[PDB]
Amino acid sequence: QTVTIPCHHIRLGDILILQGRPCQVIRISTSAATGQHRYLGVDLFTKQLHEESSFVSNPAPSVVVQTMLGPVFKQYRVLDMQDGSIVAMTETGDVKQNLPVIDQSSLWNRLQKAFESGRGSVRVLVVSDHGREMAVDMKVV
Amino acid sequence: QTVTIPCHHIRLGDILILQGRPCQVIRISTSAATGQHRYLGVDLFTKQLHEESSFVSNPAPSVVVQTMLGPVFKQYRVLDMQDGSIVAMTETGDVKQNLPVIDQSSLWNRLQKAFESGRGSVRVLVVSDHGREMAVDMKVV
């Protein structure tokens, strides 16, 4: 499940879908030949590099837009924290016992400190990869 | 005519629709009470300040997204440059004799230098405001 993002709203560090994989963009360039944009990114799950060029479209006369796809993040409540995993619950009560937390920008520690102070309103943002789920950021409500 | 942009892809300097007006965002904050984002922007045409808070939606369980609207930019060919205006043509051959160029980041000079060297492939990106059109950026093909 994905959203369309115009290329002028894509900056380094964004998470895009490259070659069907969730990736963190580390380099943006432009093709001289076509004017497409080329995004080099790091697979959030495998840590391999993927590249993909933007999709050009013409929905109307005088309207050219380049887009990439970005993931739809799910929001889960945090019920408990174990060794490197968490117990999450979807907002329909579906419990996920060992959701992994990505090692990126000390997410575990930020999350721990926020769970200590106020567990009721900690949320994790979660990406899916062909079934595998992983938490990649946090929010507070 | 507008596109939906997720709030995590909105940074200072982006052009958003605030209160129905095209604006350049100069400050982003978050409401404690609701978690919406609040965007303070400068009307591209009047130079007045407008603010507007994000729209929250729930398209699916465990999926919360905040969005703002952004304009759809049209792309026009540049046929000639006058005193502060340009002659543009849409890609269906509709000629616009005095399209104004916004004074923002020396757009006129960047545009002039690019029109001197290679007029065939200079384009302007144009926003509409209830009929009034204005060029706000340039591209080269």
CB-based contact, A120 to chain B, within 8 Å: no
Question: Tokens 């026009």 — which residue?
Answer: B76
**Cβ within 8 Å of B, A 24-83:** 35, 60-65, 70, 72-76
CA distance A51 to A41: 6
| Residue among A77, A81, A82 nearest A93 (CA) | A77
CB-based contact, B84 to chain A, within 8 Å: no
- Chain A environment of B35 (Cβ under 8 Å): 139, 141
CA distance A74 to B65: 9
CA distance A92 to A89: 8
Containing B23, the helix (H) or strand (E) segment is: strand B21-30
Q: Which residues contact B77 (CB under 8 A, 6 or more apart)?
A: B88, B89, B91, B122, B123
Sign for the CA dihedral angle at B29, B103, A63, A24 comes to negative
Give the number of residues written for chain B. Answer: 141
3-state secondary structure A113-132: HHHHHHHHHEEEEEEEECCE
Containing A2, the helix (H) or strand (E) segment is: strand A2-6
Q: Which residues contact A64 (CB under 8 A, 6 or more apart)?
A: A56, A57, A58, B75
Report the 10 Å Cβ neighbour count for B61. Answer: 12
Question: In what side-by-side order are the strands of the sheet with B15-18?
Answer: B15-18, B21-30, B37-43, B49-53
- What is the token pair recorded at B73? 């930019």
How close is the nearest chain A Cα to the Cα of B16, in Å? 11
What domains lie within chain A, and their CATH numbers?
1-71 (2.30.30.30), 72-141 (2.40.50.140)
Report the 10 Å Cβ neighbour count for B121. Answer: 13
Q: What is the DSSP string of B55-96?
A: EEEEEETTEEEEEEEEE--EEEEEEEE-SSEEEEE-TTS-EE
Q: How was this structure determined?
A: X-ray
Query: Cβ(A138)–Cβ(A104) under 8 Å?
Result: no
Burial of B126: CB neighbours in 10 Å, binned 0-12, 13-18, 19+? buried
| Residue among B126, B129, B103 nearest B17 (CA) | B129
CA distance A136 to A1: 16
Query: Cβ(A77)–Cβ(A89) under 8 Å?
Result: yes
